[PDB]
Design an enzyme around this catalytic site. Structure first.
Site, PDB file in Angstrom:
ATOM      1  N   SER A   1      14.115  22.790  -3.390  1.00 32.55           N
ATOM      2  CA  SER A   1      13.224  22.731  -2.208  1.00 32.55           C
ATOM      3  C   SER A   1      12.430  21.428  -2.273  1.00 32.55           C
ATOM      4  CB  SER A   1      12.407  24.007  -2.109  1.00 32.55           C
ATOM      5  OG  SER A   1      13.249  25.107  -1.867  1.00 32.55           O
TER       6      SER A   1
ATOM      7  N   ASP B   1      20.202  25.983   6.058  1.00 32.80           N
ATOM      8  CA  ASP B   1      19.075  26.236   5.173  1.00 32.80           C
ATOM      9  C   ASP B   1      17.924  26.858   5.953  1.00 32.80           C
ATOM     10  OD1 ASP B   1      17.774  25.253   2.403  1.00 32.80           O
ATOM     11  OD2 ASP B   1      16.362  24.981   4.063  1.00 32.80           O
TER      12      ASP B   1
ATOM     13  N   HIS C   1      18.319  29.920   1.103  1.00 36.76           N
ATOM     14  CA  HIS C   1      17.381  28.902   0.651  1.00 36.76           C
ATOM     15  C   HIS C   1      17.312  28.942  -0.866  1.00 36.76           C
ATOM     16  CE1 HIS C   1      14.246  25.967   0.884  1.00 36.76           C
ATOM     17  NE2 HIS C   1      13.356  26.753   0.304  1.00 36.76           N
TER      18      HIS C   1
HETATM   19  O1  LIG Z   1       9.411  23.721  -0.850  1.00 36.94           O
HETATM   20  C1  LIG Z   1       9.972  23.820   0.179  1.00 36.94           C
HETATM   21  N1  LIG Z   1      10.653  24.933   0.719  1.00 36.94           N
HETATM   22  N2  LIG Z   1      11.168  24.542   1.955  1.00 36.94           N
HETATM   23  C2  LIG Z   1      10.793  23.128   2.196  1.00 36.94           C
HETATM   24  C3  LIG Z   1      11.013  22.220   3.222  1.00 36.94           C
HETATM   25  C4  LIG Z   1      10.490  20.937   3.104  1.00 36.94           C
HETATM   26  C5  LIG Z   1       9.759  20.603   1.927  1.00 36.94           C
HETATM   27  S1  LIG Z   1       9.023  19.009   1.625  1.00 36.94           S
HETATM   28  C6  LIG Z   1       9.919  17.833   2.660  1.00 36.94           C
HETATM   29  C7  LIG Z   1      11.120  17.309   2.203  1.00 36.94           C
HETATM   30  C8  LIG Z   1      11.808  16.408   2.993  1.00 36.94           C
HETATM   31  C9  LIG Z   1      11.311  16.044   4.223  1.00 36.94           C
HETATM   32  C10 LIG Z   1      10.115  16.582   4.662  1.00 36.94           C
HETATM   33 CL1  LIG Z   1       9.475  16.103   6.249  1.00 36.94          CL
HETATM   34  C11 LIG Z   1       9.405  17.480   3.891  1.00 36.94           C
HETATM   35  N3  LIG Z   1       9.558  21.478   0.964  1.00 36.94           N
HETATM   36  N4  LIG Z   1      10.086  22.732   1.114  1.00 36.94           N
END
Ligand SMILES: O=c1[nH]nc2ccc(Sc3cccc(Cl)c3)nn12
EC number: 3.1.1.98
Length: 343
Positions: free
Chosen positions: A146, A244, A289
């Site tokens: 994540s 996802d 996920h």
């Molecule tokens: O920890 C979890 N669970 N689901 C998610 C989704 C995005 C994120 S950070 C992120 C990573 C890439 C781009 C952006 Cl714009 C933000 N973290 N995350």
């Protein structure tokens, strides 16, 4: 409870609230493989939502309440039945307490209510582990799920540079990014703006070559796997569900009619397209996920090959292989068209 907590000896490398960051470690004497896993858990990008996160997700902002031990699961398990890939490795779980997608390099100070030190936490864990046996490693696999998976993309080459500069050029640094490969796509009804603000709030840092491509004010681009991955020099294996759940959440997708059907199919097609030239990847057509620290991570297969097998094939490829593939991306177009998807 097989991984034991160590708070960082350099207590200026801190979680959000200034408490020491740390790592959980299970040594495997005689193994020269080290797995450093980055926990996920979103992020916070201003005073007001960091304050809210501090109220109800404090373990992601502070070490004050961390347990002494944690059980290694999935790829962090030491049992071969649960972890066919690296059960005998030295296991490190790095808790996520910087709320910065592992990108930050700023201390709590007169003008900063919170410290955002994710990039420095990784560096300090590596430096302290070198005195605990990492100096003898032959492979350091920086893995994460994540936000931790995005953290792998943002930090794997910096770990490689750090070890080179410290005098350990023989340690092979590699990355395993799970569920951190997102699209900056049109919503069905936003992350890029929250990350843009977060980066300024955290003093966030991105890999040098990616920074040089996108330049000042555009570093948020480097948080997107398909844009940062081509700039990386360390081998990186990408694990990403095609549908996802966190991608769908930010896309504001929650009896499916035509518009949503086409939206979901196009999302899977776009994800698959971004992986076409990623030689080490595992991308099942499932709505889910995370995968790598789940105890049943062995169950899913793409084209008949499990993720632990694909990772083993990747190890062999880094010593195509007959019956031992490393690029495994589903082509079927709807969630759970793969029968092995998690229930
Ligand atoms: O920890 C979890 N669970 N689901 C998610 C989704 C995005 C994120 S950070 C992120 C990573 C890439 C781009 C952006 Cl714009 C933000 N973290 N995350």
């Amino acid at each position: 409870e097989d991984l034991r907590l160590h708070l960082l000896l350099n207590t200026s490398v801190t979680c959000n609230d200034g408490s020491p960051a740390g790592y959980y470690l299970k040594e495997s004497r005689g193994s020269r493989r080290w797995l450093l896993f980055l926990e996920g858990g979103w992020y916070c990008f201003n005073r007001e939502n960091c304050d809210s996160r501090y109220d109800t997700m404090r373990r992601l902002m502070s070490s004050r309440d961390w347990p002494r031990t944690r059980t290694g699961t999935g790829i962090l398990s030491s049992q071969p039945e649960e972890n066919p890939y690296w059960w005998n490795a030295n296991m490190v779980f790095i808790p996520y307490c910087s709320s910065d997608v592992w990108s930050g390099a700023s201390s709590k100070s007169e003008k900063n209510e919170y410290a955002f030190m994710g990039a420095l936490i990784i560096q300090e864990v590596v430096r302290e582990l070198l005195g605990r046996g990492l100096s003898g490693a032959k492979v350091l696999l920086l893995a994460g799920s994540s936000a931790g998976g995005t953290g792998v993309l943002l930090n794997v080459d910096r770990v490689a540079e750090q070890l080179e500069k410290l005098g350990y050029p023989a340690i092979q640094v590699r990355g395993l990014a799970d569920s951190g490969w997102f699209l900056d796509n049109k919503q069905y009804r936003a992350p890029t703006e929250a990350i843009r603000r977060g980066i300024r709030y955290w003093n966030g840092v991105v890999p040098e070559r990616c920074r040089r491509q996108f330049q000042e004010g555009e570093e948020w681009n480097c948080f997107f796997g398909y844009k940062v991955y081509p700039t990386l020099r360390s081998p990186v294996f990408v694990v990403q569900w095609l549908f996802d759940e966190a991608q769908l959440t930010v896309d504001n997708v929650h009896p499916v009619q035509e518009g949503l059907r086409l939206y979901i199919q196009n999302l899977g097609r776009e994800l698959r397209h971004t992986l076409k030239d990623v030689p080490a990847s595992f991308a099942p057509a499932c709505l889910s996920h995370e995968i790598i620290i789940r105890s049943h991570w062995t169950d899913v297969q793409v084209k008949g090959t499990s993720l632990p097998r694909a990772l083993h094939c990747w190890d062999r490829s880094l010593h195509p292989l007959k019956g031992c593939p490393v690029h495994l991306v589903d082509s079927c177009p709807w969630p759970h068209c793969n029968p092995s998807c998690p229930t």
